[PDB]
Structure 1
Amino acid sequence: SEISRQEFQRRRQALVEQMQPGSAALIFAAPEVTRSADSEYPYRQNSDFWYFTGFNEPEAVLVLIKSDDTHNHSVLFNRVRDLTAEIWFGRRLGQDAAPEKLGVDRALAFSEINQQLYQLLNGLDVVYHAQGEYAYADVIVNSALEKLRKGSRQNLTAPATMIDWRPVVHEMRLFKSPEEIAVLRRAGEITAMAHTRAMEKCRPGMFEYHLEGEIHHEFNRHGARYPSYNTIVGSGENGCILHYTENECEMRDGDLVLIDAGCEYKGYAGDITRTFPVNGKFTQAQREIYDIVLESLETSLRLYRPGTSILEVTGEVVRIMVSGLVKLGILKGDVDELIAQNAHRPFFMHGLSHWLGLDVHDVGVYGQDRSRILEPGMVLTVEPGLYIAPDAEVPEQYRGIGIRIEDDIVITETGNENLTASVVKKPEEIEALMVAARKQ
């Protein structure tokens, strides 16, 4: 799946709809990022710029100008074509091909932006700019506005009003279109196939990073070159570290391994966590913790629908967690009192859910304590976990156990669709899968 030309057009128009007449919105591309010396990390476009363009070059600026309710036009600034630069570092779109390729009305050289931008902002009332996002963008915008302020004898005027467009754009990004949902659905399948593969390949004596290698290879072969975040493979006590990315340890028979990994497919994030036995068989103690996390997930999956919230579903999970932990002797006391004291927090210290999209921890207003009412089109994770520290004052058998199980869902009219259920999570299904792989 992919995002159509028409969809990028619709998004631009949906932003323009919300803009004041006599205004311009300025959306800047991400800068190139150094890895070491003259070498750079693989380019990752700014998510908001990407959202309006699907264009993967640096040194580009989308300018949307609204004259009134029925009159608007777009200007792109982008890199000029340069045979020497293109022989060395790769092909560029240029100005001639840009209007047709990206559906903009006009394309200018980025090298001329300081000569041109003030002319576009001259006489407008409002400029929409995400101030503080990038230093290079702020220099450009401020420089343009100073030219206009100081240029009254050349009959120039600056817009006196500057508005951060991020609240508006992130509110748009919070609600996925059918096209976006289709892309995220594929990202979920890709990510699930990778997690299945990691389970099937895992053996004692392999390193954590070996499973990372399997996962990234699987992402790549479906056309997701990059992960959406740094892959986490925490075996044993490493599972109690939420974003453990060292992935350096030999995986030991008897330990669990926690894998949090997600592909980036057409800009969109998958985000799955599966925890399983390194040797393919859960111990009793491991099952006892696993079952609590699985019940939390399965119950959350049932409950999530329009009209509830992350906060409200979290309350049900806290109850399941505190109850399970009291039965195992990990907590002691009255369940309701323990809940009132948030006695689960030493063992579950993060949120159940986050928004998901062009960023793995996606943009959009959560409301106080993530109390915002859910509506169709919102996409989020469901990731309960229990992390018992190596030195927790609890029965010995639970110490050093970290388990998270995470699915990705989209809120529908009547409930939710699970995008990541094609990778198993019931312990008997995990064991069967691993057994079948070891034979083969």
Structure 2
Amino acid sequence: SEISRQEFQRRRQALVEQMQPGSAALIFAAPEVTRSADSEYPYRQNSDFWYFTGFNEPEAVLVLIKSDDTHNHSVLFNRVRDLTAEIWFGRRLGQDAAPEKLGVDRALAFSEINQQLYQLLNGLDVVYHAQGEYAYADVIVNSALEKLRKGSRQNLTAPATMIDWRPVVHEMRLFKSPEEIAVLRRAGEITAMAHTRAMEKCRPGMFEYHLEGEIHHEFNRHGARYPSYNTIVGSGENGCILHYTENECEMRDGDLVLIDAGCEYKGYAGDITRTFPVNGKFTQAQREIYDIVLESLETSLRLYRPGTSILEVTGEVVRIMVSGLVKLGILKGDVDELIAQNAHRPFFMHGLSHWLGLDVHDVGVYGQDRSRILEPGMVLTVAPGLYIAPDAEVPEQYRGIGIRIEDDIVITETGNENLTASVVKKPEEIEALMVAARKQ
């Protein structure tokens, strides 16, 4: 599953529909990023630029011009064909091929952007520009507008109104098309396969980074070359560090390992967390905490649907957590009083859910305290966890346990679809999977 030329074109047209007549929208590619000295990180296109183009080159700018309410057209600035540069660094689309390949009306050399952009903006009323997104883009836009402002004797005029297109575009991205959901479904499947592999490979004595290696290899073999975020493999006390990425420790017999990892497939993020015993068998203490986190996730998966909110479901999870922690002696007191005091916060200190899409922490307005009412087409994670610090003032068998269990879901008319249920999470199913692997 992928997103096709015609869908990128539909998206551009949907933005044009929202624009004022006599306007232009400017969407800039990501800069290349140095890793060290003259070496660069693998290129990651800007998510918004990608959303409107599917074009993976730097030094490119998409310009959508809405001349009036019926007439509009698109211009791409992009790197010119250059034999020497291409022999060295890779093929370039160039100007001749771009209109057909991408479905834009005109293509111009990026090297000419300063000579041409002001001409495209001249006489318009509004420019849509994400000011502050990139320094290089602000320089280009500000230079064009200055030329126009100062150019009255050459009959030039600048648009006086500049509108940030991010809010409009991010609201578009918040609601996925069926084709996007298909891509996210495949991302979920690839990511789940990777997590299953990690559980089947894990043995005491392996290092945390070895599971990262298994995961990344599995992503790759399905055509997801890069993770959507840096893989977390936190064993023992490291599982209490939410974004632990050192992944440097030897995994010990008797510890849990928490793996939070997701692929990037056709631009879209998977995002799964599974926690499991390094030696294949939960201890009683580990199982007691695990059961609370799993009940939280299972209840959330039952509840999420159009018309509820992340805030509402979070309230249900908090009750499950406080109730469970009271039963184990980790919290002491009346459950409702403890809930009123947010007594769970030392142990569950992050949000339950975030949007998912072209970014792992995807764009889109959450509302105050994540109260926005859910509607079909929204995609989000569901990620309860409990983290009992090594020095917590709790019964000592619970100290140093960090557990998170996370699935990705899409809100549907009828509830939600779980995109990542193909990797096990019930403790008996985890143990059975690991027992079978450990016998091989």
Alpha-carbon shift at residue 370 of structure 1 (Å): 0.1
- The percent identity for this pair of structures is 100
**Once the two structures are superposed, what CA deviation does each residue of 1:253-273 show, in whole Å capped at 9, x if it has no partner?**
000000000000000000000
Secondary structure at the aligned position of 1:234 is classed as strand
Question: What is the DSSP-based 3-state SS (H/G/I as helix, E as strand, rest coil) of the residue aligned with 1:254?
Answer: coil
State how far apart, in whole Å, the 2-side matches of 1:378 and 1:247 are: 32
- Give the Å deviation of 1:112: 0.2
CA apart distance, 1:242: 0.2
Once residues 150 and 116 of structure 1 are traced to their aligned partners in structure 2, the CA distance between those partners, rounded to angstroms, is 16
For 1:23-80, what per-residue CA distance to the aligned partner results, in whole angstroms no more than 9, with x for missing partners? 0000000000000000000000000000000000000000000012211000000000
Q: Distance in 1 between matches of 2:365 and 2:94?
A: 37
Q: Does 1:385 align with 2:376?
A: no
Runs of 4+, deviation exceeding 3 Å: none
Q: Deviations over 1:291-348 (max 9, x none)?
A: 0000000000000000000000000000000000000000000000000000000000
Q: Which residue does the alignment assign to 2:111?
A: 111
* CA–CA distance in structure 1, aligned partners of residues 350 and 92 of structure 2: 43
d(CA) in 2 for partners of 1:315 and 1:69?
47
Deviates more, 1:3-12 or 1:22-31: 3-12
Q: Distance in 2 between matches of 1:6 and 1:254?
A: 53
CA RMSD between the two structures: 0.3
Following the alignment from structure 1 to structure 2, what is the Cα–Cα distance between the partners of residues 20 and 284? 63
Gaps of 5+ in 1: none
SS of structure 1 residue aligned to 2:94: coil
SS in 2 for 1:423: coil
Aligned residue for 1:95, secondary structure, equals helix
- State the alpha-carbon separation in 2 of the partners of residues 90 and 378 from structure 1: 37
1:144 aligns with 2:144: yes
Q: CA deviation at 1:224?
A: 0.2
Alpha-carbon distance in 2 for matches of 1:24, 1:422 = 45
C-alpha deviations, 1:106-139, integer Å up to 9, x for none?
Answer: 0000000000000000000000000000000000
Post-superposition Cα deviations, 1:223-253, rounded to whole Å, max 9, x if no partner, equal 0000000000000000000000000000000
Q: Report deviation, 1:169.
A: 0.1
Q: What's the secondary structure of 2:182's corresponding residue?
A: helix
Residues 1:73 and 2:73 are matched in the alignment: yes
Tell me the TM-score normalized by structure 2: 1.00
Distance in 2 (alpha carbons) for counterparts of 1:43 and 1:9: 23
> CA deviation digits over 1:4-41, x for unaligned, max 9?
11110110011000000000000000000000000000
Post-superposition offset of 1:202? 0.2
Matched, 1:323 2:323: yes
Q: Could you tell me how far apart the structure 2 residues matched to 1:123 and 1:67 are? A: 10
Structure 2 SS opposite 1:68: coil
Q: For 1:392-421, what per-residue CA distance to the aligned partner results, in whole angstroms no more than 9, with x for missing partners? A: 000000000000000000000010000000
Offset at 1:439?
Answer: 1.5
Q: For residues 264-275 of structure 1, what are the structure 2 equivalents within 5 Å?
A: 264-275=264-275
What is the alpha-carbon distance in structure 2 between the residues aligned to residue 68 and residue 38 of structure 1? Answer: 46
What are the residue-to-residue correspondences of 1:354-365 with 2, within 5 Å?
Answer: 354-365=354-365
Structure 2 unaligned residues grouped into runs of 5+? none
Spell out, residue by residue over 1:123-158, the C-alpha distance to the aligned partner (whole angstroms, 9 max, x if none).
000000000000000000000000000000000000
Instruction: Please give the alpha-carbon distance, in whole angstroms, between the structure 2 residues aligned to 1:38 and 1:198.
Output: 35
Cα distance in 2 between the residues matched to 1:68 and 1:330: 65
Secondary structure at the aligned position of 2:7 is classed as helix
TM-score when normalising by structure 1: 1.00
